[PDB]
Amino acid sequence: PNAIITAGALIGGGLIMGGGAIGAGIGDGIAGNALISGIARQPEAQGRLFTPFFITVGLVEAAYFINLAFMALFVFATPGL
Amino acid sequence: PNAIITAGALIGGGLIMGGGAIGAGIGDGIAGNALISGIARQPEAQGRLFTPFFITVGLVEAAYFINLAFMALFVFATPGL
Amino acid sequence: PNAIITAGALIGGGLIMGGGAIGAGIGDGIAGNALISGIARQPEAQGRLFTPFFITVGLVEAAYFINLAFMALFVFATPGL
Amino acid sequence: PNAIITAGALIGGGLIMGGGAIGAGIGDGIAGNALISGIARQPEAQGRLFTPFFITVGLVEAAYFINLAFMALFVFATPGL
Amino acid sequence: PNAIITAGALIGGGLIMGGGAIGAGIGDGIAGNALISGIARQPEAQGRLFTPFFITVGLVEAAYFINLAFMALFVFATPGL
Amino acid sequence: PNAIITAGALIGGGLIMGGGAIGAGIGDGIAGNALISGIARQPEAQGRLFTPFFITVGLVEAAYFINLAFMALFVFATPGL
Amino acid sequence: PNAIITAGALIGGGLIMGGGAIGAGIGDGIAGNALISGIARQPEAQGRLFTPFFITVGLVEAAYFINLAFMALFVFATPGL
Amino acid sequence: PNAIITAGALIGGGLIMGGGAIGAGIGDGIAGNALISGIARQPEAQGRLFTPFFITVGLVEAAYFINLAFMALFVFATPGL
Amino acid sequence: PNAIITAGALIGGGLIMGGGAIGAGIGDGIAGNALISGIARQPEAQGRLFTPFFITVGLVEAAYFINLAFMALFVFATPGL
Amino acid sequence: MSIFIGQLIGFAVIAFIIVKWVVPPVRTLMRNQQEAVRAA
Amino acid sequence: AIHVGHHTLVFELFGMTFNGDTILATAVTAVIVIALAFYLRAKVTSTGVPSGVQLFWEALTIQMRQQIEGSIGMKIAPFVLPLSVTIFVFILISNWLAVLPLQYGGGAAAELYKAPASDINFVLALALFVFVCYHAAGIWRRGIVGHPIKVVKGHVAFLAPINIVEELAKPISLALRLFGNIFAGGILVALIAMFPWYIQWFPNAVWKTFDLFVGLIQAFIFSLLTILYFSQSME
Amino acid sequence: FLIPNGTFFAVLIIFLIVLGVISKWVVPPISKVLAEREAML
Ligand SMILES: O=c1c(NCc2ccccn2)c(-c2ccc(N3CCOCC3)cc2)c1=O
């Protein structure tokens, strides 16, 4: 019974981290695209843009790491089981 | 019987947190792209841009956290046992 | 039999909310990108940009909540059970 | 035999709605981004942009709600049951 | 025997329709973004932009319809059943 | 044995068509966005623009139709059946 | 044994081919957007944008065709049995 | 036991390849969009833009090619047999 | 039982790597789009643009590699085995 | 009854919302339109 | 559990089955629309300050005429104005009437008035009437021989197979967009009915407002797509 | 649920009746009112 629950938890965690990776990568890429476009526009603005950029990256990584913690819950502390 | 239901609930919760992370990361990245761009064009606009930002993020993160709650449902209070 | 149907309903509801969360988050982020960019370009336009924004949100959030409905149908009122 | 078909129909309808909601949310967000940007650029656009906008939404919602109709067939009137 | 085939056909049709809806909704939203932006830039464009637009929409929704057709070939008819 | 292989072939063909339709719809929408934007910005380039457009669509649709070719092979020929 | 392996191979090949289709279609659409826009802004660039374009497409197609090959290796040949 | 692990490995390798192909195609298209836009704007920029381009592609394709190796590991010499 | 657990772990690791590859490819492409656009706009700013670039990449690739690490845990450690 | 009471309370909440935030603006618009017609 | 269909007051006549609840809801919305129309007639004035219903009718007619003139002038399509307007109100009043507190407990949840759009028959009637009407308009303007030719030809000739299908899609979607939007809601508000009243009250308020918003949006979209179909079929 | 029945006609007739009342006693009077407003200025 556990083997079925364990396989289900592994698949669930795989989806968990796959979605986390997609969201994190794409959101960070978009934020960095904005940062690079802003610095090309105004190369002296590199210092100013790190605050909004790091706020956006912090939000995206908070989502990613909360999801990675829930994968850890699924895999190492599988609910139920 | 319970093992199959638990495995299905774990797979469902993994799908929900995965989609939620995709949505949250990508939407937050898209919103932060506008934030960083606008602050690059208008350095002083920061004050007025964090209100539309946290509003939109407030929506996007909401879509995330709702999912989180329901995923706990799926995994801790899994209906249909 | 009810165990298999319950597992399938849980997986289906997980897919429903994964898609709904992706759509809602990404659409809210895309609309917020326009809102932030417009308020950066036109600070006085904020009041006028909320009506196009909250309409757009009102659409995507609707698509979210409709999904939230049919998840609750799948999970709490599993058709065919 | 009916339990397997019911679980498969639930999963299929979940996929239908996941795709429909992803499409609806993202397309509505994109259309609203266009609407908000156009109204920010030229405020009086408020009048003329709701015609092409609600056409776009009308196209974005169709693919969603048609799927929803075919969801009801899958879930409530499973073709192969 | 036919139960497994029917469940697989339902899942396949759900995948078909979910992918078709994602493609149609997102492509229609993207095309309507250009339509709305063009009409905002030039109200007279209202007249001439529907020809490029409705070509796109139609090509974008072709894939939706063909997919839909084959979904009708999956759940109502069923190869190998 | 044939039932399981047929269900797997149906699921695989559904995945193929879902992915093909996602790609086709989104790529056609993206190409038509450029077509509409160019025709709005330069009305006289309509005929000038349908050449690079139908080429790109021709590429995108090609990717779609190959996939359709394979889906038939999956559901009607079903290699390994 | 061969039935389960063949069903898994069909599902895996469908995933390969559908993902390749999504990537190819969306990348071709994105590259065609740049091609069409550049040709709109520059009639002459028609000749010179085909070199950056077919290179990009060459990459976008490459990842597609490789998948196709592996998809064949999944379905016609079977690495397991 | 070996058949189940083989089917799971085939499905996992298919997921790996689908994800790698989506990432590769879409990233290559996005990079080639910038390349084509820059070469349309400035035609003499070609030689300058192939270094930023092939770096990006080098990263993008790298993520793709890694997924190949692990796919082989999943497909050939399946772990946990 | 390990057979089921190993198959589930393989599917989960495949999902992890598929999501990681999608995120890495798309984010790297998006960041390189900004890099190419900036280096086209400001040829002399390459040095000031590569630092934001490799930062952005350093984020998205991290999300990839972290996922990869956990893939190994799923594929070689198999925590629930 | 419980379903009826719950949906009635929801209807009351939405009615209050529209009366306090949607009725005022629409009403203005109606009055301003009437005033414009009278002035014309 | 939730039920789909299960129409009440269902009867049989002339060899055909009729959903009594759907017909009753359609009749209620129709009589409300007719009452509004007759109150305007009784209180319509151009020499004096307009009435509230007069202002509403003027605004709706002005909007619909603005959409018509911007795509197909009323010198060519004057008949689509009385159509696009009614389709709006008939739908709008149909949807907003579902916002009244007419839901109760059987213990399965039930509603005295259920939105007509939630029935496939209502949406199909409206959509197929629009389909027939604008196809007749296209036949009139282009001729019975030229109208099918230009329909198949479309804007791009070699895309003919993608044209005909789209033409058959217009009605279905036009119906399915309206039905799915409202039918879905009929399930959500039923699902909310599973909550206890002290938890049920808030979700109904939130959804009801969406139902108001989405019903208005769907009426507008349905009417505007009807006007667009007329613009396309009338050259 | 998706299969139509006689209601398709029953609704249609009612709609037509509405389409009559609006097309006669609403749209023409409102068009007359708007035309007179335009002529007044
Ligand atoms: O709604 C409307 C809708 N499509 C929504 C939908 C339905 C089914 C599946 C997916 N999406 C259309 C529509 C109308 C015409 C059209 N062209 C005419 C010119 O030649 C090319 C084709 C294309 C689209 C709506 O109007």
Coordinates of N, CA and C in Angstrom, one line a residue, chain K residues 8-139:
Chain K
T8 N -37.3 21.0 -14.2 CA -38.6 20.9 -13.6 C -39.7 21.4 -14.5
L9 N -40.9 21.0 -14.3 CA -42.1 21.4 -15.1 C -41.9 20.9 -16.5
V10 N -41.1 19.9 -16.7 CA -40.9 19.3 -18.1 C -42.2 18.7 -18.5
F11 N -42.6 19.0 -19.8 CA -43.9 18.4 -20.3 C -43.6 18.0 -21.7
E12 N -44.7 17.4 -22.3 CA -44.6 16.9 -23.7 C -45.8 17.3 -24.5
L13 N -45.6 17.8 -25.7 CA -46.7 18.3 -26.5 C -46.2 18.3 -28.0
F14 N -47.1 17.9 -28.9 CA -46.8 17.9 -30.3 C -45.7 16.9 -30.6
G15 N -45.5 15.9 -29.8 CA -44.5 14.9 -29.9 C -43.1 15.4 -29.5
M16 N -43.0 16.6 -28.9 CA -41.7 17.1 -28.5 C -41.7 17.4 -27.0
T17 N -40.6 17.2 -26.4 CA -40.4 17.5 -24.9 C -39.9 18.9 -24.7
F18 N -40.5 19.6 -23.7 CA -40.2 20.9 -23.4 C -39.8 21.1 -21.9
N19 N -38.8 21.8 -21.7 CA -38.3 22.1 -20.3 C -39.1 23.2 -19.8
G20 N -40.1 22.9 -18.9 CA -40.9 23.9 -18.3 C -40.2 25.0 -17.5
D21 N -39.2 24.6 -16.8 CA -38.5 25.6 -16.0 C -37.7 26.6 -16.9
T22 N -37.1 26.1 -18.0 CA -36.4 27.0 -18.9 C -37.4 27.9 -19.6
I23 N -38.5 27.4 -20.1 CA -39.5 28.2 -20.7 C -40.1 29.3 -19.8
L24 N -40.3 28.9 -18.5 CA -40.8 29.8 -17.5 C -39.8 30.9 -17.3
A25 N -38.5 30.6 -17.1 CA -37.5 31.6 -16.9 C -37.4 32.6 -18.2
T26 N -37.5 32.0 -19.4 CA -37.5 32.8 -20.6 C -38.7 33.7 -20.6
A27 N -39.8 33.2 -20.2 CA -41.0 34.0 -20.2 C -40.9 35.1 -19.2
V28 N -40.4 34.9 -18.0 CA -40.2 35.9 -17.0 C -39.3 37.0 -17.5
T29 N -38.2 36.7 -18.1 CA -37.3 37.7 -18.6 C -37.9 38.4 -19.8
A30 N -38.6 37.7 -20.6 CA -39.3 38.4 -21.8 C -40.4 39.3 -21.3
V31 N -41.1 39.0 -20.3 CA -42.2 39.9 -19.8 C -41.5 41.1 -19.1
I32 N -40.4 40.9 -18.4 CA -39.7 42.0 -17.8 C -39.2 43.0 -18.9
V33 N -38.7 42.4 -20.0 CA -38.2 43.2 -21.1 C -39.4 44.0 -21.7
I34 N -40.5 43.3 -21.9 CA -41.7 43.9 -22.5 C -42.2 45.0 -21.6
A35 N -42.2 44.8 -20.3 CA -42.6 45.8 -19.4 C -41.8 47.0 -19.5
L36 N -40.4 46.8 -19.6 CA -39.5 48.0 -19.8 C -39.9 48.7 -21.1
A37 N -40.1 47.9 -22.1 CA -40.4 48.6 -23.4 C -41.7 49.4 -23.4
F38 N -42.7 48.8 -22.7 CA -44.0 49.5 -22.7 C -44.0 50.7 -21.7
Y39 N -43.2 50.6 -20.6 CA -43.0 51.8 -19.8 C -42.3 52.9 -20.5
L40 N -41.4 52.5 -21.4 CA -40.7 53.6 -22.2 C -41.8 54.1 -23.1
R41 N -42.6 53.3 -23.7 CA -43.5 53.9 -24.7 C -44.4 54.8 -23.9
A42 N -44.8 54.5 -22.7 CA -45.7 55.3 -21.9 C -45.1 56.5 -21.4
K43 N -43.8 56.5 -21.4 CA -43.0 57.6 -20.8 C -41.8 57.9 -21.6
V44 N -41.9 58.0 -22.9 CA -40.8 58.4 -23.8 C -41.1 59.8 -24.3
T45 N -40.2 60.7 -24.2 CA -40.3 62.1 -24.5 C -39.0 62.7 -25.0
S46 N -39.1 63.4 -26.1 CA -37.9 64.2 -26.6 C -37.9 65.6 -26.2
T47 N -39.1 66.2 -25.9 CA -39.2 67.5 -25.5 C -39.0 67.8 -24.0
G48 N -38.9 66.7 -23.2 CA -38.7 66.8 -21.8 C -37.5 66.0 -21.3
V49 N -37.3 66.1 -20.0 CA -36.2 65.4 -19.3 C -36.5 63.9 -19.4
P50 N -35.5 63.1 -19.8 CA -35.8 61.6 -20.1 C -36.0 60.9 -18.8
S51 N -36.8 59.8 -18.9 CA -37.0 58.9 -17.8 C -35.8 58.0 -17.6
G52 N -35.8 57.3 -16.5 CA -34.7 56.3 -16.3 C -34.6 55.2 -17.3
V53 N -35.8 54.6 -17.6 CA -35.8 53.6 -18.6 C -35.5 54.2 -20.0
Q54 N -36.0 55.4 -20.2 CA -35.6 56.1 -21.5 C -34.1 56.3 -21.6
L55 N -33.5 56.7 -20.5 CA -32.0 56.9 -20.5 C -31.3 55.5 -20.8
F56 N -31.8 54.5 -20.2 CA -31.2 53.2 -20.4 C -31.4 52.7 -21.8
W57 N -32.6 52.9 -22.4 CA -32.8 52.5 -23.8 C -32.0 53.4 -24.7
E58 N -31.9 54.7 -24.5 CA -31.1 55.5 -25.3 C -29.6 55.1 -25.3
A59 N -29.1 54.8 -24.1 CA -27.7 54.4 -24.0 C -27.4 53.1 -24.7
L60 N -28.3 52.1 -24.5 CA -28.1 50.9 -25.2 C -28.2 51.0 -26.7
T61 N -29.2 51.7 -27.2 CA -29.4 51.9 -28.6 C -28.2 52.7 -29.2
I62 N -27.7 53.7 -28.5 CA -26.6 54.5 -29.0 C -25.3 53.6 -29.1
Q63 N -25.1 52.8 -28.1 CA -24.0 51.9 -28.1 C -24.1 51.0 -29.3
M64 N -25.2 50.3 -29.5 CA -25.3 49.3 -30.5 C -25.2 50.0 -31.9
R65 N -25.8 51.2 -32.0 CA -25.6 51.9 -33.3 C -24.2 52.3 -33.5
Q66 N -23.4 52.6 -32.5 CA -22.0 52.9 -32.6 C -21.2 51.7 -33.1
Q67 N -21.5 50.6 -32.6 CA -20.8 49.3 -33.1 C -21.3 49.0 -34.5
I68 N -22.5 49.2 -34.8 CA -23.0 48.9 -36.2 C -22.4 49.8 -37.2
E69 N -22.4 51.1 -36.9 CA -21.9 52.1 -37.9 C -20.4 52.0 -38.1
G70 N -19.7 51.5 -37.1 CA -18.2 51.3 -37.2 C -17.8 50.1 -37.9
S71 N -18.7 49.2 -38.2 CA -18.4 48.0 -39.0 C -19.3 47.9 -40.2
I72 N -20.6 48.1 -40.1 CA -21.5 48.1 -41.2 C -22.6 49.2 -41.0
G73 N -22.5 50.2 -41.7 CA -23.5 51.3 -41.5 C -24.9 50.9 -41.6
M74 N -25.8 51.6 -40.9 CA -27.2 51.3 -41.0 C -27.9 51.6 -42.3
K75 N -27.2 52.3 -43.2 CA -27.7 52.4 -44.6 C -27.7 51.0 -45.2
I76 N -26.9 50.1 -44.7 CA -26.9 48.7 -45.3 C -27.5 47.7 -44.4
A77 N -27.4 47.9 -43.0 CA -27.9 47.0 -42.0 C -28.7 47.7 -41.0
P78 N -29.8 48.3 -41.3 CA -30.6 49.0 -40.3 C -31.4 48.0 -39.4
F79 N -31.5 46.8 -39.8 CA -32.3 45.8 -39.1 C -31.5 45.2 -37.9
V80 N -30.2 45.2 -38.0 CA -29.4 44.6 -36.9 C -29.4 45.5 -35.6
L81 N -29.9 46.7 -35.7 CA -30.0 47.5 -34.5 C -31.0 47.0 -33.6
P82 N -32.3 46.8 -34.0 CA -33.3 46.3 -33.1 C -33.0 44.9 -32.7
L83 N -32.1 44.2 -33.4 CA -31.7 42.8 -33.0 C -30.6 42.9 -31.9
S84 N -29.5 43.5 -32.2 CA -28.4 43.6 -31.3 C -28.8 44.1 -29.9
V85 N -29.7 45.1 -29.9 CA -30.2 45.6 -28.6 C -31.0 44.5 -27.9
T86 N -32.0 43.9 -28.5 CA -32.8 42.9 -27.8 C -31.9 41.7 -27.3
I87 N -31.1 41.2 -28.2 CA -30.2 40.1 -27.8 C -29.5 40.5 -26.5
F88 N -29.1 41.8 -26.4 CA -28.4 42.2 -25.2 C -29.4 42.1 -24.0
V89 N -30.5 42.8 -24.0 CA -31.3 42.9 -22.8 C -31.9 41.5 -22.5
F90 N -32.4 40.8 -23.6 CA -32.9 39.4 -23.4 C -31.9 38.6 -22.6
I91 N -30.6 38.7 -23.0 CA -29.6 38.0 -22.3 C -29.3 38.6 -20.9
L92 N -29.1 39.9 -20.9 CA -28.7 40.6 -19.7 C -29.8 40.3 -18.6
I93 N -31.0 40.6 -18.9 CA -32.1 40.4 -17.9 C -32.2 38.9 -17.5
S94 N -31.8 38.1 -18.5 CA -31.8 36.6 -18.2 C -30.8 36.3 -17.2
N95 N -29.6 36.9 -17.3 CA -28.5 36.6 -16.4 C -28.7 37.2 -15.0
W96 N -29.0 38.5 -15.0 CA -29.1 39.2 -13.7 C -30.3 38.7 -12.9
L97 N -31.3 38.2 -13.5 CA -32.4 37.6 -12.8 C -32.0 36.5 -11.9
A98 N -30.9 35.8 -12.3 CA -30.4 34.7 -11.5 C -29.7 35.2 -10.2
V99 N -29.5 36.5 -10.1 CA -28.9 37.1 -8.9 C -29.8 37.3 -7.8
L100 N -31.1 37.1 -8.1 CA -32.1 37.2 -7.0 C -32.0 36.1 -6.0
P101 N -32.4 36.3 -4.8 CA -32.3 35.2 -3.7 C -33.4 34.1 -3.9
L102 N -33.3 33.4 -5.0 CA -34.4 32.4 -5.3 C -33.8 31.0 -5.2
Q103 N -32.8 30.8 -4.4 CA -32.2 29.5 -4.2 C -32.5 29.0 -2.8
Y104 N -32.9 27.7 -2.7 CA -33.4 27.1 -1.5 C -32.9 25.7 -1.4
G105 N -33.2 25.0 -0.3 CA -32.9 23.6 -0.1 C -34.1 22.7 -0.4
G106 N -33.9 21.7 -1.2 CA -35.0 20.8 -1.6 C -35.5 20.0 -0.4
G107 N -32.8 17.3 0.4 CA -31.9 18.4 0.8 C -31.1 19.0 -0.3
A108 N -31.2 18.5 -1.5 CA -30.5 19.0 -2.7 C -30.9 20.4 -3.0
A109 N -30.0 21.3 -3.3 CA -30.2 22.7 -3.6 C -31.1 22.8 -4.9
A110 N -32.0 23.8 -4.9 CA -32.8 24.0 -6.0 C -33.0 25.5 -6.2
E111 N -33.5 26.0 -7.3 CA -33.7 27.4 -7.6 C -35.0 27.6 -8.3
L112 N -35.8 28.6 -7.8 CA -37.1 28.9 -8.4 C -36.9 29.4 -9.8
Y113 N -35.9 30.3 -10.0 CA -35.6 30.8 -11.3 C -34.1 30.5 -11.7
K114 N -33.9 29.6 -12.7 CA -32.6 29.3 -13.1 C -32.4 29.9 -14.5
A115 N -31.2 30.5 -14.7 CA -30.9 31.3 -15.8 C -31.2 30.5 -17.1
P116 N -32.0 31.1 -18.1 CA -32.3 30.4 -19.3 C -31.0 30.0 -20.1
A117 N -30.0 30.8 -20.0 CA -28.7 30.5 -20.8 C -28.1 29.2 -20.3
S118 N -28.4 28.8 -19.1 CA -27.8 27.5 -18.6 C -28.4 26.3 -19.3
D119 N -29.5 26.5 -20.0 CA -30.1 25.5 -20.8 C -29.6 25.6 -22.3
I120 N -29.2 24.4 -22.8 CA -28.6 24.5 -24.2 C -29.7 24.9 -25.2
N121 N -31.0 24.7 -24.9 CA -32.1 25.1 -25.8 C -32.1 26.6 -26.0
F122 N -32.0 27.3 -24.9 CA -32.1 28.8 -25.0 C -31.0 29.4 -25.8
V123 N -29.7 29.0 -25.5 CA -28.6 29.5 -26.2 C -28.6 29.1 -27.6
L124 N -29.0 27.8 -27.9 CA -29.1 27.4 -29.3 C -30.2 28.1 -30.1
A125 N -31.3 28.4 -29.4 CA -32.3 29.2 -30.1 C -31.8 30.6 -30.5
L126 N -31.2 31.3 -29.5 CA -30.6 32.6 -29.8 C -29.5 32.5 -30.9
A127 N -28.6 31.6 -30.7 CA -27.4 31.5 -31.7 C -27.9 31.1 -33.1
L128 N -28.8 30.1 -33.2 CA -29.2 29.7 -34.5 C -30.1 30.8 -35.1
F129 N -30.9 31.5 -34.4 CA -31.6 32.6 -34.9 C -30.7 33.7 -35.5
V130 N -29.6 34.0 -34.8 CA -28.6 34.9 -35.3 C -28.0 34.4 -36.5
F131 N -27.6 33.1 -36.5 CA -27.0 32.5 -37.6 C -27.9 32.6 -38.9
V132 N -29.1 32.2 -38.8 CA -30.0 32.2 -39.9 C -30.2 33.7 -40.4
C133 N -30.3 34.6 -39.4 CA -30.6 36.0 -39.8 C -29.5 36.6 -40.5
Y134 N -28.2 36.4 -40.0 CA -27.1 37.1 -40.8 C -26.7 36.3 -42.0
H135 N -27.0 35.0 -42.1 CA -26.8 34.3 -43.3 C -27.8 34.8 -44.4
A136 N -29.1 35.0 -44.0 CA -30.1 35.6 -44.9 C -29.7 37.0 -45.3
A137 N -29.1 37.8 -44.4 CA -28.7 39.1 -44.8 C -27.5 39.0 -45.8
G138 N -26.6 38.1 -45.6 CA -25.5 37.9 -46.5 C -26.0 37.4 -47.9
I139 N -27.0 36.5 -47.9 CA -27.6 36.0 -49.1 C -28.2 37.2 -49.9

